[PDB]
Amino acid sequence: QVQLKESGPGLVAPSQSLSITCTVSGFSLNSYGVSWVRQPPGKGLEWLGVIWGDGSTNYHSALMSRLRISKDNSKRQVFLKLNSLQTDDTATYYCTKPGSGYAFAYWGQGTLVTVSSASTKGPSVFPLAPGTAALGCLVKDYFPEPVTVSWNSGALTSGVHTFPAVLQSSGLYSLSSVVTVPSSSLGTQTYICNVNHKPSNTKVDKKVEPA
Amino acid sequence: ENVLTQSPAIMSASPGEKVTMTCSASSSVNYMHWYQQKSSTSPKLWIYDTSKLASGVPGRFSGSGSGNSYSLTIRTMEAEDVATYFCFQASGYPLTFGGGTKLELKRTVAAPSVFIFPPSDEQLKSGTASVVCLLNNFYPREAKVQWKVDNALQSGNSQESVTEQDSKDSTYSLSSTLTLSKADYEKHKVYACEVTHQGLSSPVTKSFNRG
């Protein structure tokens, strides 16, 4: 079963270098080419390059040979290295592989890379306190993306809408997560939002209580 | 490079309607591949080598064409077909994708539920007031949210965020956040949002009094 998984830094500064690793499984790297594709946030897909089984490579010429792709067969890893970064390189980066023919059929989950001179900040989390009631949490002033939010650790998914993050005029992101529930259940059930920001090692669990 | 132009870029279709989207290349290619992407997760191969459905893909989908001009067609539009669709060619370097075709489901009018949240006491002590207007489960996307502070219309001080179309009911949700300093917030008494939407007879207002 072909699997691919990317890992890299969430945040790197301009003119520095980016490096991401793809761990692969289910096929021989000696036999099969592996490619890299990125997606700038809210835009389309761009192919970056490919390393064939024999070790030869092809790169998108627009990159101006700022990109190098390499691999180690015994580790089962493929490495993306991108030099002299510009804020334009901020993107979700995917490793991917064809199946039959040349269409890409297997994709990693992808890894968001933000290119910025700004520093990590963890969010503050504030309750939005509540026959249909809404309640929520406001996840304010964090950097960079992304934040993950769940309600009652996954037990509550019906009624849950988590908005896209918005860049505020301060250069920080904020988002809201809400859930609709019956009025009747406010007095009985407790509601807790679980917020996670990996780039700062912040895990906040916030009770949202009627006022 | 070989530029792929997809048309239309934005499209909606009522359930059971035939939809078609084209991808055009500036130079001829051996085949065209198509990817479906839902809600910023990894793209999924959908159609490969021009007309072969990937496994799992239902028979209402088809692709055709040759040379420079390819098409993806859905005979009966379903709610689960809401997605962005990207064409891709791998017949010559650099490999290239189209800019995408965003497919919306054009369902029946549904009026929003409206909720207002005052800032939490915890946010206020940090020096900031975020007031939140929630519009839940509505259709179409076009809505007018207007903030009034002591019956005065606000301008340029609120940010809006919208969910993608829901998988089950095909509605939207919208949050709008009015952000100001605590010192400014405590200088006014009544905060209200006013929602206009074709699912509503007259504009709906929700409001509170600081206290």
Q: Report the residue of B120, B133, B159, B209 to disrupt the A interface, i.e. the one with the largest count of A CBs within 10 Å.
A: B120
CATH 2.60.40.10 domain range(s) in chain A:
120-211
Q: Which two tokens stand for residue A95?
A: 């490793």
- Is A120 exposed, middle or buried, given 0-12, 13-18 or 19+ CB atoms closer than 10 A? middle
A29: left (phi over 0), alpha (psi -120 to 50) or beta: alpha
Give the architecture (CATH level 2) of A120-211: Sandwich (2.60)
CA distance A63 to A36: 13
A154 three-class SS: helix
Q: Verify that B4 and B14 share a domain, yes or no.
A: yes
DSSP state of A129: -
Subunit contact B120:A100, Cβ cutoff 8 A: no
Tokens 């995408």 belong to: B100
Q: Verify that B161 and B186 share a domain, yes or no.
A: yes
CA distance B156 to B133: 16
Subunit contact A176:B161, Cβ cutoff 8 A: yes
Instruction: Give residue A194's Cα distance to chain centre.
Output: 18
Please name the residue of chain B whose CA is at the shortest distance from the CA of residue A104. Answer: B45
Domain boundary among B107, B141, B169: B107
Domain interval for residue B18: 1-107
B18 three-class SS: coil
CA distance A142 to B40: 20
Q: Verify that B99 and B115 share a domain, yes or no.
A: no
3-state helix, strand, coil in chain A (%, to 5): 5, 50, 40
Q: Verify that B70 and B87 share a domain, yes or no.
A: yes
- Resolution, angstroms, 1 dp: 2.5
Closest to A144 (Cα-Cα) out of A48, A63, A46, A41: A41
B100: Cβ contacts below 8 Å, ≥ 6 apart: A44, B6, B9, B37, B84, B85, B86
Q: Is the distance from CB of A101 to CB of B49 less than 8 angstroms?
A: yes
Q: What technique solved it?
A: X-ray
Q: Verify that B195 and B149 share a domain, yes or no.
A: yes
Subunit contact B97:A44, Cβ cutoff 8 A: yes
Domain boundary among B61, B90, B107: B107
Q: Is the distance from CB of A123 to CB of A142 less than 8 angstroms?
A: yes
Domain boundary among B45, B77, B107: B107
Q: Verify that B92 and B132 share a domain, yes or no.
A: no
Subunit contact B45:A174, Cβ cutoff 8 A: no
Q: Verify that B94 and B130 share a domain, yes or no.
A: no
| Structural domains counted in chain B | 2
Measure A13 CA to nearest chain B CA, in Å: 24
